[PDB]
Design an enzyme around this catalytic site. Structure first.
Site, PDB file in Angstrom:
ATOM      1  N   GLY A 192      39.457  51.304  12.856  1.00  0.00           N
ATOM      2  CA  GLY A 192      39.855  50.930  14.195  1.00  0.00           C
ATOM      3  C   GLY A 192      40.239  52.242  14.841  1.00  0.00           C
ATOM      4  CG  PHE A 209      46.103  54.423  15.747  1.00  0.00           C
ATOM      5  CD1 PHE A 209      46.670  55.631  15.364  1.00  0.00           C
ATOM      6  CD2 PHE A 209      46.002  54.137  17.104  1.00  0.00           C
ATOM      7  CE1 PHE A 209      47.100  56.556  16.326  1.00  0.00           C
ATOM      8  CE2 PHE A 209      46.440  55.057  18.064  1.00  0.00           C
ATOM      9  CZ  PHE A 209      46.986  56.256  17.667  1.00  0.00           C
ATOM     10  CB  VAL A 248      38.540  47.903   9.210  1.00  0.00           C
ATOM     11  CG1 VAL A 248      38.258  46.403   9.141  1.00  0.00           C
ATOM     12  CG2 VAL A 248      39.220  48.258  10.551  1.00  0.00           C
ATOM     13  CE  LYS A 275      43.191  47.343  13.606  1.00  0.00           C
ATOM     14  NZ  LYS A 275      42.622  47.502  14.968  1.00  0.00           N
ATOM     15  CG  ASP A 303      39.285  51.998  23.599  1.00  0.00           C
ATOM     16  OD1 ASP A 303      38.418  52.711  24.179  1.00  0.00           O
ATOM     17  OD2 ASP A 303      39.550  52.091  22.376  1.00  0.00           O
TER      18      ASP A 303
HETATM   19  C1  LIG Z   1      43.310  42.736  14.362  1.00  0.00           C
HETATM   20  C2  LIG Z   1      42.322  43.278  13.373  1.00  0.00           C
HETATM   21  C3  LIG Z   1      42.319  42.864  12.035  1.00  0.00           C
HETATM   22  C4  LIG Z   1      41.333  43.338  11.183  1.00  0.00           C
HETATM   23  C5  LIG Z   1      40.359  44.200  11.681  1.00  0.00           C
HETATM   24  C6  LIG Z   1      40.435  44.580  13.020  1.00  0.00           C
HETATM   25  C7  LIG Z   1      39.442  45.500  13.624  1.00  0.00           C
HETATM   26  N1  LIG Z   1      39.881  46.522  14.455  1.00  0.00           N
HETATM   27  C8  LIG Z   1      38.805  47.186  14.785  1.00  0.00           C
HETATM   28  N2  LIG Z   1      37.666  46.659  14.253  1.00  0.00           N
HETATM   29  C9  LIG Z   1      36.308  47.125  14.545  1.00  0.00           C
HETATM   30  C10 LIG Z   1      35.877  46.595  15.964  1.00  0.00           C
HETATM   31  F1  LIG Z   1      35.954  45.245  15.932  1.00  0.00           F
HETATM   32  F2  LIG Z   1      36.786  46.961  16.902  1.00  0.00           F
HETATM   33  C11 LIG Z   1      38.062  45.565  13.494  1.00  0.00           C
HETATM   34  C12 LIG Z   1      37.166  44.648  12.766  1.00  0.00           C
HETATM   35  C13 LIG Z   1      37.387  43.220  12.812  1.00  0.00           C
HETATM   36  C14 LIG Z   1      36.541  42.343  12.181  1.00  0.00           C
HETATM   37  C15 LIG Z   1      35.429  42.861  11.474  1.00  0.00           C
HETATM   38  N3  LIG Z   1      34.467  42.267  10.770  1.00  0.00           N
HETATM   39  C16 LIG Z   1      33.651  43.262  10.282  1.00  0.00           C
HETATM   40  C17 LIG Z   1      34.087  44.482  10.675  1.00  0.00           C
HETATM   41  N4  LIG Z   1      35.225  44.248  11.428  1.00  0.00           N
HETATM   42  C18 LIG Z   1      36.105  45.116  12.045  1.00  0.00           C
HETATM   43  N5  LIG Z   1      41.399  44.139  13.847  1.00  0.00           N
END
Ligand SMILES: Cc1cccc(-c2ncn(CC(F)F)c2-c2ccc3nccn3c2)n1
Length: 303
Positions: free
Chosen positions: A18, A20, A23, A36, A137
């Site tokens: 992410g 920050f 993941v 995350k 963003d």
């Molecule tokens: C609140 C939270 C919990 C867990 C992960 C994330 C997350 N943040 C950025 N990304 C990457 C993009 F989505 F911005 C993810 C993300 C989320 C789901 C997913 N499935 C396959 C890859 N993935 C990435 N956010």
């Protein structure tokens, strides 16, 4: 205990990052989830993102499904966790890099993106009310693609929320917080009036127009499509500075090129028109996410 908690989750695979936090794909009671992970010194970022995702009435098919915020002590240090639905396709950035899409495929991706943004931006006043939220963003790396070919918006950590009753934004917003490449003209030249919440919704619309351009390039008709590129790939270097972006977007007044071939197809003509109406330098002239949703809904019905 029926609720999802960190102690019951097992990490299986590193699946990127992410803004920050790192993941991971994890398993919770037989199901795949995204996790995350933040360190203890990143508590502010973790907490602010947990706070945005816990907003009353936020859940929507085109917004990442938030499961829980939790801590996990491994016996040496504490990890701060955010848990969400897992989407095997990953980001729209990854998806558009791997695949070309059909006209139907393009409309589904664009409409679902606009529907999630309309929900984020929508204020619901009253009991169990929902504050209007601006992303700050939005970009193709912050949108995920579901198995059904639709999108959901993610990485809400830099979001701002509006309280209409007091006409205030919940935080003291810093200038130019997002990805430089996708910053709106008014963000790049710092003319944005950050005391007016509508300014943040408008800046999100500009970024959504750039994402639509990225999708439209990958629309294959009669086997004809453009290769994958980020907006401004032809004008700025990789990792561009605010100054490099501002010279292109604000001074020279350039936008991503709209190819001649997009006029040969009705869906592409509708997409190109939305892009131009998201890219106006004056934020007040831009379409709303709700108007874009209605336009693309009309188009999906016809198709
Ligand atoms: C609140 C939270 C919990 C867990 C992960 C994330 C997350 N943040 C950025 N990304 C990457 C993009 F989505 F911005 C993810 C993300 C989320 C789901 C997913 N499935 C396959 C890859 N993935 C990435 N956010």
């Amino acid at each position: 205990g029926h609720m999802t908690i960190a102690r019951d989750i097992v990490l299986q695979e590193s699946i990127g990052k992410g803004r920050f936090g790192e993941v991971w794909r994890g398993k919770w009671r037989g199901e795949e989830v995204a996790v995350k992970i933040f360190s203890s010194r990143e508590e502010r970022s973790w907490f602010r993102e947990a706070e945005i995702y816990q907003t009353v009435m936020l859940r929507h098919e085109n917004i990442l499904g938030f499961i829980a915020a939790d801590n996990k002590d491994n016996g040496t240090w504490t990890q701060l966790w955010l848990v969400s639905d897992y989407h095997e396709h990953g980001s729209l950035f990854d998806y558009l890099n791997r695949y070309t899409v059909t006209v139907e495929g393009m409309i589904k991706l664009a409409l679902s993106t606009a529907s999630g943004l309309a929900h984020l931006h929508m204020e619901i006043v009253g009991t169990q009310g929902k504050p209007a939220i601006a992303h700050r963003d939005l970009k193709s790396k912050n949108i995920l693609v579901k198995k059904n070919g639709t999108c959901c918006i993610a990485d809400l950590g830099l979001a701002v929320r509006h309280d209409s009753a007091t006409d205030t934004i919940d935080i003291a917003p810093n200038h130019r917080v997002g990805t430089k490449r996708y910053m709106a003209p008014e963000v790049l030249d710092d003319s944005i009036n950050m005391k007016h919440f509508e300014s943040f919704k408008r800046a999100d619309i500009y970024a959504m127009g750039l994402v639509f351009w990225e999708i439209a390039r990958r629309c294959s008709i009669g086997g004809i499509h453009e290769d994958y590129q980020l907006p401004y790939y032809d004008l700025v270097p990789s990792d561009p500075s605010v100054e490099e972006m501002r010279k292109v977007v604000c001074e020279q007044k350039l936008r991503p090129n709209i190819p001649n071939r997009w006029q040969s197809c009705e869906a592409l003509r509708v997409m190109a028109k939305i892009m131009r109406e998201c890219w106006y330098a004056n934020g007040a002239a831009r379409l709303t996410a709700l108007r874009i949703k209605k336009t693309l809904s009309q188009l999906s019905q016809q198709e």
